[PDB]
Design a binder for this molecule. Structure first.
Ligand SMILES: Nc1ncnc2c1ncn2[C@@H]1O[C@H](CSCC[C@H](N)C(=O)O)[C@@H](O)[C@H]1O
Ligand SMILES: Nc1ncnc2c1ncn2[C@@H]1O[C@H](CSCC[C@H](N)C(=O)O)[C@@H](O)[C@H]1O
Ligand SMILES: CCCCCCCC(=O)O
Ligand SMILES: CCCCCCCC(=O)O
Lengths: 356, 358
C-alpha cells in the first residue's frame, strides 16, 4: 500500500551514469577535504566511511578512494578502513560486489587494509550503529522520496511533480521531501561520530526555482503519449506513472536548521547551489554527432528513471512487455533529442554537514 | 575465469527447503549461546560484531543470531550496538537476505532495537572483515563447499559427489583442496576474531565409518540424471561436466591444521563433536505414512542446495528456460524415486568451537 520508487537498472547503470559522475565531481573535493581534517577514532579502531545510496557502486569508487588516500596520510597503513555501502533491499548488491572485486579502480585493489560491506535497508531509518561513522557520503540519492505521498493526486499529465499544475500534488510531494530530509538528517546525526562529517550531493532547484532537464522532460512525456497513441501503453497505466523525485531549493535544505543553525546535533558547514556542466551538449558542440547526443541523454534517463515507470505497467517487471516498453521508450527519447539538440540545466546542491 | 566455482543456493526455494539444515544445526546453537556469555567485547563506540559466514537467504541465521544477542543483552546495556555481518559469495541473492531480515517476524531486527545488519559478498577463503573486530563467529553448512573444482582434477565420470567416485586421483585432488581451504578459512578467521573470541562451525562430516551419508538420495540423484540423458533432456557431455564441489571432513581432517601441539594461526579447538542428525523426514514418514511428502521433502532439500551447481554445467545459460525445466524435472524424478522406497538416511555432521588466544 506504500508505493516506493524502483532502484536503478542494474544492467545499464554503470555505463549510463557519466552525467551523475561529472556532476558529483566538485563534491569529491569537499569529501577529500573533510577526510583531511575530521577527528578520528582512537587507534587502532577501524575508521568507518558510509556511502548512502550506492546503486551498482561505479560512481562511488572515486569519492571512496579520495577519502581513503587522505586518511592514509593520517593513520598507520595497517589500520582498518571499513566502507559501508547502503541502498534499498531490492538494489542489485551482486552487481555492487562484482564492481568491488573486478573494477581496477576499486579501493579494495588499491588499499590492502580497506574493507567493504553493504546495507540493504532504507536510509530514512537508522541503519548503522550510533557514533561510528567518521565520514558520510551521499550522491544523487536523497532526491528520491521514501514514497509517493499518501492520498496525493494522480499526476494526470506529467511524470515529474515540478512540471505538474496540480497544486495539491505539489504540496504533498514538498511535504514528503521535507519529512524525508528531516528523517535523513536525524538518523545520520545519530550514526556519525562526534565531530564527523557528511557530504551530500542532490538534485536542486536553480536560482530561478527551476527543476531543469526541460528538453529531456518534454521528450519523455511526448514519447509516453506516443505509446498510448500506438496502443503500446494503456491510458490508465500512463496516469499511474510518477517519478518520486523532488529537487530541493536552498531554503528547503536549510529548513531543519533555521534559525539557530542546528538540527539533531548537525549543522551546515558549507552549502553550494550550482549548475553542473552539460557534458553531452559540450560533446555535441565539438563533434556534431546528434545521434550520440540523443543516445547519451536517453541512456541516462533509462537507467535512473525507467524502472520506476515500468513498475506502473499492468504486467510484471520481469514480463517481456516491460523490457519492450523500456527499450522503445529509450529509442523514442533518443530520436526526439537527436532531432533538435539543446543545452540543459543540471541544478545541483552540495552540502558539508558536521556533527557536534 | 578458468577457476570453476560452485553455485549459490536457489534463493527462490532455499528458505522453504532448508528445514533439514535448520534441524541439524540446532545443537551448535547451544555452543554459540554459551560462547556469547563470556567472549570479550570491543571498546566503545565499536559495535559488538557477530559474523555469519555463509548466510544464503538468511532464513537459518535468525535463531543462532537471536540466541547470541539474548545472551549479550544479559551482559551489556540495551542501547549497546550489536552488528551482525552476514557473509557469502558475490552472486548470492542479498536482496532475498535483506527481505528476510525485514519481513520475517523471527528476524533479530524485530526483536532487538539496537541490533544492526550488514552483508559481505566476498569469498570467506580470504580475509573479509577488519582484524580483531569479531567477538563471535558462526558458520553452518557452508565450509563443506570447496573454493573451486581442483585444478587438473579428472572429470567425475559416473558421479557428482567425490566420496562416491572410484577415481583415486580425483579423490586425492578434492581432499587436498579441502585441506587447503580449511587452513585458509582458519587463517583468516584467526585474524578477524578478537583475542579470546569464539567461532562455532557446523559442517558436513564423514561418520565413524568414514561414510558420506545420504546414500539413498545419492543413488536417486545419479539415477535421475541418467534418466534425463537417456530421455534426451540432458547431453552426455553436460552430465560428464557435472560435479558438486562439496567435501565432507573426518575428525582427523578437521584436526589436521592443529596437530600435534593444538594450535593453528592463533586458534585452537575447544570442543569438537561428530554426530548424525536425526532424520526428521524419515521420522515423519514413520508417523504419517505419506510417501509422497517424504519424497518431496528430500527432493526439495537437494534442489535448493545442489541443483544450481548442476545447472551451471548446462550448455544453455542459467537464466535459460531449459535450465529451469532441468531443475524442475530433476526434482520430480528424485522425489518419485524416494517416495517409491522410503528409507532412513545418515546425515553426518561435525560441530566445533574454536577459540582465539587471549
Ligand atoms: N530510501 C532509500 N534508501 C537507500 N537508498 C535509496 C533510497 N531511495 C533511493 N535510493 C537509492 O539511491 C540511488 C540513486 S543512484 C545514485 C548512485 C550513486 N551514488 C551515484 O552518484 O551515481 C539508487 O541506488 C536508489 O536505489
Ligand atoms: N567461499 C565461500 N564464501 C562465502 N560463502 C560461501 C562460499 N562457498 C559457499 N558459500 C555459501 O555457503 C552457503 C551454504 S547454505 C548454508 C546457509 C545457512 N548458513 C544454513 O545453515 O542453512 C551458500 O549460501 C553458499 O553460497
Ligand atoms: C529528469 C529527472 C532526472 C533524474 C535523475 C536521477 C539520477 C539518479 O538518481 O541517479
Ligand atoms: C547429498 C549432498 C547434500 C549436500 C547438502 C548441502 C546443504 C547446504 O549447503 O545448505
Amino acid at each position: 500500500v506504500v508505493v516506493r520508487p524502483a532502484p536503478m537498472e542494474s544492467a545499464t547503470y554503470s555505463q549510463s551514469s557519466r552525467l551523475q559522475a561529472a556532476g558529483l565531481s566538485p563534491a569529491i573535493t569537499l569529501f577529500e577535504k573533510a577526510a583531511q581534517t575530521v577527528p578520528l577514532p582512537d587507534a587502532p579502531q577501524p575508521v568507518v566511511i558510509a556511502d548512502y545510496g550506492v546503486a551498482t557502486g561505479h560512481n562511488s569508487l572515486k569519492p571512496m578512494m579520495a577519502a581513503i588516500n587522505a586518511l592514509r596520510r593520517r593513520i598507520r597503513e595497517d589500520r582498518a578502513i571499513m566502507v559501508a555501502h547502503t541502498d534499498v533491499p531490492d538494489n542489485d548488491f551482486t552487481a555492487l560486489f562484482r564492481t568491488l572485486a573486478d573494477d581496477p579502480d576499486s579501493y579494495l585493489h588499491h588499499d590492502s587494509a580497506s574493507f567493504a560491506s553493504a546495507v540493504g535497508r532504507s536510509f530514512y531509518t537508522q541503519i548503522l550503529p550510533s557514533n561510528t561513522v567518521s565520514l558520510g557520503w551521499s550522491s544523487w540519492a536523497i532526491q528520491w522520496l521514501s514514497r509517493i505521498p499518501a492520498g496525493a493526486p494522480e499526476l494526470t499529465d506529467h511524470v515529474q511533480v515540478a512540471y505538474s499544475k496540480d497544486e495539491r500534488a505539489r504540496a504533498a510531494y514538498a511535504h514528503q521531501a521535507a519529512t524525508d530530509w528531516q528523517d535523513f538528517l536525524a538518523f545520520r546525526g545519530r550514526e556519525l561520530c562526534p565531530g564527523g562529517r557528511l557530504v551530500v550531493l542532490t538534485m536542486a532547484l536553480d536560482e530561478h526555482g527551476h527543476f531543469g532537464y526541460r528538453p529531456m522532460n518534454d521528450a519523455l512525456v511526448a514519447a509516453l503519449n506516443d505509446q498510448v497513441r500506438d496502443g503500446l501503453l494503456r491510458p490508465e497505466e500512463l496516469r499511474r506513472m510518477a517519478i518520486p523525485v523532488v529537487a530541493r531549493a536552498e531554503k528547503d535544505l536549510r529548513a531543519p536548521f533555521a534559525p539557530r543553525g542546528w538540527f539533531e546535533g548537525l549543522t551546515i558547514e558549507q552549502l553550494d547551489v550550482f549548475n553542473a556542466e552539460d557534458r553531452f551538449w559540450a560533446a555535441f558542440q565539438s563533434d556534431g554527432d546528434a545521434e550520440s547526443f540523443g543516445a547519451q541523454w536517453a541512456g541516462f534517463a533509462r537507467a535512473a528513471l525507467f524502472p520506476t515507470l515500468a513498475a506502473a505497467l499492468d504486467c510484471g517487471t520481469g514480463d517481456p512487455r516491460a523490457t519492450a516498453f523500456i527499450e522503445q521508450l529509450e529509442a523514442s527519447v533518443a530520436d526526439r533529442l537527436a532531432s533538435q539538440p539543446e543545452p540543459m540545466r543540471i541544478p545541483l546542491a552540495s552540502l558539508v554537514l558536521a556533527k557536534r
